Amino acid sequence: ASEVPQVVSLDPTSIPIEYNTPIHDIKVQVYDIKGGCNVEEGLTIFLVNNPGKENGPVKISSKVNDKQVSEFLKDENMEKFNVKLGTSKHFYMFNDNKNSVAVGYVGCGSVADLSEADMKRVVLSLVTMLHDNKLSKLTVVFEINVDKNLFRFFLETLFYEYMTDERFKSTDKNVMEYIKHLGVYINNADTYKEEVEKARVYYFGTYYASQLIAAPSNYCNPVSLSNAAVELAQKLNLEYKILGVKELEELKMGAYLSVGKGSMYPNKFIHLTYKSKGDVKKKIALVGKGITFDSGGYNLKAAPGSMIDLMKFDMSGCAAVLGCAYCVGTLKPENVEIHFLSAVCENMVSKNSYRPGDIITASNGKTIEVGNTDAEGRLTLADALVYAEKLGVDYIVDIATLTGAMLYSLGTSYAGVFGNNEELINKILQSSKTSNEPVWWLPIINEYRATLNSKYADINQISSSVKASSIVASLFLKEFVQNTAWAHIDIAGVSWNFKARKPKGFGVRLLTEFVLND
Amino acid sequence: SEVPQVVSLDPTSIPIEYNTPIHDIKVQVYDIKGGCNVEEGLTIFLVNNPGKENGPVKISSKVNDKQVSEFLKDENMEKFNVKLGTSKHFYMFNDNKNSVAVGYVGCGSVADLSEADMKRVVLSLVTMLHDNKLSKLTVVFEINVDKNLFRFFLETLFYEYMTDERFKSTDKNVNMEYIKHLGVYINNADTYKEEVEKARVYYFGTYYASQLIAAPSNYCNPVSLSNAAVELAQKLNLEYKILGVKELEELKMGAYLSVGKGSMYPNKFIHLTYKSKGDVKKKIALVGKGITFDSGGYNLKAAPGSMIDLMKFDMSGCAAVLGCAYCVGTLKPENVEIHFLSAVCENMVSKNSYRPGDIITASNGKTIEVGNTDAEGRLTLADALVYAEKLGVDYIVDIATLTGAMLYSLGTSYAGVFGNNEELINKILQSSKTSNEPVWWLPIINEYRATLNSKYADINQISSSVKASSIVASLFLKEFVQNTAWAHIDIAGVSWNFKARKPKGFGVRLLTEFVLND
Amino acid sequence: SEVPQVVSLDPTSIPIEYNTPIHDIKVQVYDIKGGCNVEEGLTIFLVNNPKENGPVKISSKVNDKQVSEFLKDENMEKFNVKLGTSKHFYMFNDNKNSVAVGYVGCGSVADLSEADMKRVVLSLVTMLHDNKLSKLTVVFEINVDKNLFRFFLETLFYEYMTDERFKSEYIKHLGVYINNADTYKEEVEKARVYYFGTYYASQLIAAPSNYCNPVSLSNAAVELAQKLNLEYKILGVKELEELKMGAYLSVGKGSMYPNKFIHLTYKSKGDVKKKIALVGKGITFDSGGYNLKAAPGSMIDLMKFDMSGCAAVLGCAYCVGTLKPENVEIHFLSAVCENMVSKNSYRPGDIITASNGKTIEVGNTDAEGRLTLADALVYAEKLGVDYIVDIATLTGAMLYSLGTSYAGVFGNNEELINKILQSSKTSNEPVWWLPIINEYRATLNSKYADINQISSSVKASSIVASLFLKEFVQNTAWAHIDIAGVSWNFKARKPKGFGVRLLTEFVLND
Ligand SMILES: CC(C)C[C@H](NC(=O)[C@@H](O)[C@H](N)Cc1ccccc1)C(=O)O
Ligand SMILES: CC(C)C[C@H](NC(=O)[C@@H](O)[C@H](N)Cc1ccccc1)C(=O)O
Ligand SMILES: CC(C)C[C@H](NC(=O)[C@@H](O)[C@H](N)Cc1ccccc1)C(=O)O
Ligand SMILES: [Mg+2]
Ligand SMILES: [Mg+2]
Ligand SMILES: [Mg+2]
Ligand SMILES: [Zn+2]
Ligand SMILES: [Zn+2]
Ligand SMILES: [Zn+2]
């Protein structure tokens, strides 16, 4: 725990973090649809679709244990409504005990397997029914087919979208009550019950990352972010070490140190370790890019579209890695040891900053000619990757908001994965499938390597000719892993939900599924 | 108090000239019905010809000299016309056989001169004074002017004639000599006589603001500007207090303090007070934006057209308020108490600067999400407005070089006024009329308020979607006045005289007439 | 048809060379086992060292004592194998004849990539361009695939050939020494064919927009079909109107050249087991239209290359027509036009109707290729084929995603994408599969028309364009190959002729 330096006494000295959220107070009950649905207080929503028939009629198929509600939901009455994806309706009636009940449905369209994107749309509709309605309970009845992973994703997403982050509200808090109870009716319920607590853990790891990402750069700087990581390790009983500048100089981490030279906050390198109590069969290092604010440095983000105002989000890789630490430390997988690493710093303009053209020496002794101070993420990752390989692990996976070009290549929905090992890339792609966080495999094109040849240094930080900047970044990172299966996930395009004006906490579940299924 | 320096050659005060050559001019007013004595120096007739576009000159005054009367006969004048701003010089021997210079300035053919027309007249008169070593000027009014326009004539003559040589060293004008006497002949002289020393006061308030504005950012910084304000207050016997960082921290002025974080000069908040002896019937806070240099901060003024080289002028608001303090302190109105306020600081790039995205807390507890460090003026004004309202005043008027959009809406001639109270706005418009500093009322459009809703903080500093930036800045300021009549004068477009390459000292006479009228 | 002219000096046809010096090279391949004969011309060894940039050491026996001396280890040690490094020396052989002997460095890595083999070849071509030689012999002291061997041959031939049509010497023999020489012999004439289809494509692309316009390009395609005995049909503006190709006709509106739609057909002898339509973007000059290419980086000077897909599809027609694969039927389609600024041009905001009835709101007149392809895809689908593959210089964003080396392929059918990926492997023209992300589809929801041509929000423009194209195929396996990044060799200042060998491999394989 280090002291956060301040310029004025009003500067904050820690990131506010909510651990005990209202989602954690929700009691979840799962029931099998074969027993019929009981319809009482709160709101009961049926998820309904109509395979084949685009915008086909709503038909409720579950038995409802109430004659009045059954009459209301009969085919004749329901057929005037359709299943258009995201569409919803509210119903009011008196049940058999003469107590008014609210019921409704959300349309799930006409395609029998919902994509992760479609399910998100269903959930967003559901959340709009929760908002601006003081409810003690929500009950959801599944009349659509979902596998266990998709069921879990539904719950994670519901929890995540429902939770409102009011840490920075003062005079403008939403005068917002949360349900206390969530009932779920589904066929073969016993088989889905295990997903409930798993969803609740994955929600929090995601939401925890999101809290770190949304925290502004005055709150979340390298000192306060490494202090938060210390606190998280203490809560989960993970080992931890925070390396400070004296130890970083001793390790010759010149690339990482150069990036931080301009900051009033000392670099802090985060190292958390989870080890299973049994025989360790796999060792994994997860590396996250940890830039708490990216101004660009002397290559200032001044160009139209450079989005300097969003650059508190440049520690999203680090957040995903810490969200993963939360999930792993909670679920406690066996036979594995996991290292959670981030070379945390801030990229600023100062008499002290590194310069375009500076030649700096990484910890593996490679000299690097700086071509653009705004390509700082790959310099911090270079040193974090050398540290990670020294740990003697089987896999290194880094995750980073590394290149704006991702917005032009995969866009805002899919992350890109690059790597030096196909078995490991396939594992990441499998984790993507079971986490429902989409990733697409992109190539490291060796032909571009030659454009990183420096006239003076051992290597160039950037290409002068190749515009394929995400692949060029990957080529540069590859030079810092000598003999270990490595994969790199570029989340520059996917991390921030531009429409909703908030983080996604992208990568937490992906990396956790990777760890668990190994 | 002590001005920090980087090197010993950095200046530690603003040079300020109080006893200017204008102050040494002996001014006499005579009634025109006694006829004009033409004895020495230069004698200029102000002549028009109503109806006749570019009509002939006809000198109507009685002239007490046969030789000069002969010269000025209609036949001899008929070659010349009254085209606005046109002028001629004549040379002749008078009755005492002493050579004299005589001439005229054409005042056009519209019998009521606008402020801009009158400025054109004065500029032509001034070109006759330049490059001619004269000890005396006499001006004969053969046009119609009310008392306010006569005063405007003199104020404008004084200000345009005065040349600012404080930063000249090897290039002072070896030929500049100023007249020692000004004679004025006008109909109903006795009623105009009162205007002479009022003009001299108003000239000085305006010229003082001008000196402060023109003083570059290495001379005029938060420390030297607040020191100059103390010296002013001492000279006029005003109560004064300068609030330093520790007091500002105690007052929780987090928005103002965040702006000045990246500067080598500590924040200084100026608070001067004039109080009439006797019953105080109106209490007024005048608030001036006082950014001594606006680099833009991490949103650096680097786009083409951003005028970074002009940004020493971003304390023009504060200068108008201090110019006003000079006039009020000199003229001593009854029945009022006036607070002259400025939150002074410099907006710089540093490891210590606030960043885009930072969430800061204003002195009224509202949290603000910073969307652009270059919208700094509204942050400093926010805390200054909160401070003003705590004083328990009847009216709060702020004046500020706030938005570049003023150049596209009103341009360089008229300031914009916005406000929450129609009677206050009308007072300002009234003062605009009698000061001859033009102002136009612009709307605060509440439909745009929703664009300042922040996802995380209570409010956004800037709009995501609305390009009407002067209106959006007024919506933001309005959030920091709770229940007091308030108006905001945006002088961004009018403050600097781009053609003459000098300040106008805009707003000193406006604000003084506002105080005096009330 | 006759090409319109503004002045009598305007060209009325594209000059094409069919018979090239490459066609006069006699090629012979020999087994390395019996040693090499260095009797005449230039001999180059392809040598690696599996020591990084370590020394050259030559292992083949040579049947000349003087040359054998030159090639002794002690001498060869002074040179290194760094990929693409070369040296060659003139000397007198055993019968006092002048010969030149050298090596090209093949690096330290066993499997040579496509890109590495290109480097080897550029270095070889550097020597050929600089020397008056009647014969070249190449000795493979490195291991190559049959396919990579053919690739070596195609690249050699293509790079060596110089295009002099607009300006106002070659070897006559090629000897190749290689292990298991008998297995590589059938690669030789296949390469010569792939060379020419690629070179032809390159000639159309390199041809400036005053020479190559929708009229002269369609005339060239007719002449190709005639030389090859393919069926051909050029659709003119009247038939295009009859067919309601309003998206395509709109793009052509501002141009002095009438739109011409090319449709060539290859049919196999024997039972036709597969039908395929290959559709190429054929914009003969893309100015951007009222959305003019004026922005820094917009490369308006290169936009003669905007018919590269069309050229790939015609080069493929040459290969298919020549090689004559069986059990397959192939349609070669291109909706050719030119995108210009005029009083007659289509405008930003215009609503146009495609041949399948879909109305389209134009957001950008520079997204013209997808409009021409929309009509071409409808046309293609009406043919009842098994696969439709289009190839197009569609989005500048490709430079930012895959870059200049690898094309992107998007599709609606994994089986078909997999076949294209495999054709990529065997052609050695690299392609990477990119996703059609359906979450972006809603951004093409137009307020007024059935669909928007462009997204306002999504910057992933190559995916957006694919989502748009996808709306014009209803029920047929389809893939789209975006070659905007890949088509032009910026550094060498010439086309690559990219896609010809890919599509021919696709046709020959499946
Ligand atoms: C100089 C370039 C090769 C690299 C440069 N990279 C960066 O700026 C990273 O440090 C940025 N964090 C990338 C970024 C930009 C916009 C939105 C999301 C992510 C980029 O522009 O992407
Ligand atoms: C970021 C924007 C919404 C607000 C911004 N405002 C400012 O820069 C003020 O701090 C400027 N001092 C106002 C200004 C700009 C140009 C000329 C004269 C005056 C402006 O660009 O007008
Ligand atoms: C408006 C956009 C969505 C589409 C636009 N597309 C085009 O300009 C195509 O018609 C161009 N022919 C593609 C192109 C541009 C630059 C370099 C190589 C290739 C583009 O610039 O990508
Ligand atoms: Mg950067
Ligand atoms: Mg500013
Ligand atoms: Mg175009
Ligand atoms: Zn970054
Ligand atoms: Zn400012
Ligand atoms: Zn095009």
Measured CA to CA, the distance from residue C184 to residue C138 in angstroms comes to 14
CA of A292, closest CA in chain C: separation in Å? 25
Q: Are residues A477 and A395 in the same domain?
A: yes
DSSP B331-372: H--SSEEEEEEEEEEEE--STTS--TT-EEE-TTS-EEE-S-
Q: Are residues B339 and B484 in the same domain?
A: yes
Binding site of A for a peptide, by residue number, is: 289, 294, 301, 314, 374
CB B459 within 8 A of CB B452: yes
Resolution (A): 2.0
Q: Is residue B5 part of a domain?
A: no
Q: Are residues C161 and C230 in the same domain?
A: no
Helix (H, G, I), strand (E, B) or coil at B306: coil
Q: Are residues B47 and B145 in the same domain?
A: yes
Q: Are residues C262 and C191 in the same domain?
A: no
Helix axes of C414-427 and C146-160: crossing angle, nearest 10 degrees: 70
The pair of three-digit structure tokens given for residue C229, joined into one six-digit string: 């005995």
The pair of three-digit structure tokens given for residue A475, joined into one six-digit string: 């080529």
Please list, in sequence order, all residues whose beta carbon lies within 8 angstroms of the beta carbon of residue B26, skipping any fewer than 6 positions away. B180, B181, B182
Query: Tokens 């001439």 map to which residue?
Result: B103
CB C334 within 8 A of CB C310: yes
Backbone conformation region of residue A210, classed left if phi is above 0, alpha if psi is from -120 to 50, else beta: alpha
Q: How was this structure determined?
A: X-ray
Nearest CA in chain A to C460: A408
Helix axes of B508-517 and B194-214: crossing angle, nearest 10 degrees: 140
The pair of three-digit structure tokens given for residue B505, joined into one six-digit string: 């000292």
> Chain B residues contacting A, CB < 8 Å?
245, 249, 252, 254, 257-258, 261, 298-300, 302-303, 349-352, 354-361, 364-367, 369-372, 454-459
Nearest CA in chain A to C116: A447
Please list, in sequence order, all residues whose beta carbon lies within 8 angstroms of the beta carbon of residue B422, skipping any fewer than 6 positions away. none
The answer to whether the Cβ–Cβ distance between A408 and C400 falls below 8 Å is yes
Q: Which protein residue's CA is at the shortest distance from atom 17 of ligand 1?
A: A404
Q: Is residue B10 part of a domain?
A: no
DSSP state of A57: B
User: In DSSP terms, which residues pair with C55 in a beta bridge?
Assistant: C80
Q: Are residues A82 and A148 in the same domain?
A: yes
Q: Is residue B451 part of a domain?
A: yes
Q: Are residues A269 and A191 in the same domain?
A: no
The pair of three-digit structure tokens given for residue B166, joined into one six-digit string: 């404080």
CA A375 to ligand 7 center in whole angstroms: 7
Q: Where do the DSSP E strands lie in B356-494? A: 359-361, 367-369, 395-400, 415-419, 439-441, 459-460, 485-490
- Nearest Cβ partner of A349 from B349, B364, B372? B349
Residue B422: Cβ within 10 Å count: 11
Encoded amino acid at C313, one letter: V
User: Which residue of B351, B363, B367, B373 is the best one to mutate when testing the A interface, meaning the one whose CB has the most A CBs within 10 A?
Assistant: B351
How far is the CA of A16 from the CAs of A175, B359, C443, in angstroms? 21, 12, 37
Q: Are residues C122 and C219 in the same domain?
A: no
The pair of three-digit structure tokens given for residue A447, joined into one six-digit string: 């032909």
Ligand 1, CB within 6 Å, residue ranges: A 294, 307, 314, 372, 374-377, 401, 403-405, 462, 469, 492
Domain boundary among B179, B194, B216: B216
Domain boundary among C154, C186, C208: C208
Measured CA to CA, the distance from residue B67 to residue C179 in angstroms comes to 122
CA B417 to ligand 5 center in whole angstroms: 19
CATH code, domain with A396: 3.40.630.10
User: In DSSP terms, which residues pair with B496 in a beta bridge?
Assistant: B503
Q: Are residues A193 and A119 in the same domain?
A: yes
Measured CA to CA, the distance from residue C380 to residue C375 in angstroms comes to 9
Mutation test residue for ligand 2: of B347, B403, B490, the one with most atoms within 8 Å of CB: B403
Q: Is residue B3 part of a domain?
A: no
Measured CA to CA, the distance from residue B145 to residue B153 in angstroms comes to 9
Pocket flag, ligand 3, residue C482 (CB < 6 Å): no
Chain centre to alpha carbon of residue B165? 19
Measured CA to CA, the distance from residue A108 to residue A47 in angstroms comes to 6
Q: Are residues A339 and A465 in the same domain?
A: yes
- Ligand at shortest distance from the CA of B402: 2
Which spans in C324-413 are helix H? 368-381, 398-401
Short-list B237, B448, B226, CA closest to B315: B226
Q: Is residue B12 part of a domain?
A: no
Short-list B435, B417, B402, CA closest to B515: B435
CATH code, domain with A140: 3.40.220.10
CB A383 within 8 A of CB A361: no
Tell me which chain B residues have a C-beta less than 8 angstroms from the C-beta of A217. 355, 357-358
Domain boundary among A177, A196, A216: A216
Measured CA to CA, the distance from residue B38 to residue B93 in angstroms comes to 10
Question: Active-site residue C132, yes or no?
Answer: no
Encoded amino acid at B351, one letter: K
Question: Active-site residue C293, yes or no?
Answer: yes
Query: Tokens 């050695």 map to which residue?
Result: C428
Atom of ligand 1 nearest to the CA of A495: 18
Helix (H, G, I), strand (E, B) or coil at B319: helix
Q: Is residue C1 part of a domain?
A: no
Please list, in sequence order, all residues whose beta carbon lies within 8 angstroms of the beta carbon of residue A514, skipping any fewer than 6 positions away. A397, A427, A428, A431
Short-list A152, A178, A174, A151, CA closest to A163: A178
CB B385 within 8 A of CB B419: no
Encoded amino acid at C199, one letter: Y
Measured CA to CA, the distance from residue C394 to residue A38 in angstroms comes to 56
Provide the residue range defining the domain that includes B425.
217-518
Tell me which chain A residues have a C-beta less than 8 angstroms from the C-beta of C298. none
Q: Are residues A473 and A324 in the same domain?
A: yes
Short-list C487, C484, C435, C486, CA closest to C464: C435
CA R_g for chain A: 25
Pocket flag, ligand 3, residue C454 (CB < 6 Å): yes
Q: Are residues C149 and C222 in the same domain?
A: no
Q: What sign results for the dihedral spanned by CA atoms A6, A11, A14, A15?
A: negative
Measured CA to CA, the distance from residue B205 to residue B323 in angstroms comes to 4
Measured CA to CA, the distance from residue A350 to residue A260 in angstroms comes to 11
CA A464 to ligand 9 center in whole angstroms: 26
User: Which residue of C405, C410, C428, C433 is the best one to mutate when testing the A interface, meaning the one whose CB has the most A CBs within 10 A?
Assistant: C405
User: Which residue of C401, C417, C421, C432 is the best one to mutate when testing the A interface, meaning the one whose CB has the most A CBs within 10 A?
Assistant: C401
Q: Is residue C3 part of a domain?
A: no
CB B490 within 8 A of CB B444: no
DSSP C172-198: SEEEEEETTHHHHHHHHHHHHHHHHHH
CA of A169, closest CA in chain B: separation in Å? 5
| Buried/exposed code over A260-298 (b: 16+ C-beta within 10 A; e: otherwise) | bbbbbbbbbbbbbbbebeeeeeebbbbbbbbbbbbbbbb
Query: Tokens 């290409």 map to which residue?
Result: A463
Helix (H, G, I), strand (E, B) or coil at A137: strand
Atom of ligand 3 nearest to the CA of C298: 16
Helix (H, G, I), strand (E, B) or coil at A431: helix
> Chain C residues contacting A, CB < 8 Å?
113, 115, 397, 399-406, 432, 434-435, 437-440, 458-463, 485
Tell me which chain B residues have a C-beta less than 8 angstroms from the C-beta of A7. 261, 352
Angle at B412 between CA B408 and CA B413, to 5 degrees: 120
Measured CA to CA, the distance from residue C333 to residue C445 in angstroms comes to 29
Measured CA to CA, the distance from residue B159 to residue B211 in angstroms comes to 11
Measured CA to CA, the distance from residue B376 to residue C358 in angstroms comes to 51
Instruction: Quote the number of domains for chain C.
Output: 2
Pocket flag, ligand 2, residue B375 (CB < 6 Å): yes
Atom of ligand 2 nearest to the CA of B306: 16
Q: Is residue C5 part of a domain?
A: no
Pocket flag, ligand 2, residue B405 (CB < 6 Å): yes
Measured CA to CA, the distance from residue B46 to residue C452 in angstroms comes to 68
How far is the CA of C237 from the CAs of B166, B285, C2, C355, in angstroms? 77, 76, 14, 14
The answer to whether the Cβ–Cβ distance between A8 and B261 falls below 8 Å is yes
Burial class (CB in 10 A: 0-12, 13-18, 19+), B8: exposed
How far is the CA of C276 from the CAs of B373, C325, C482, in angstroms? 59, 13, 19
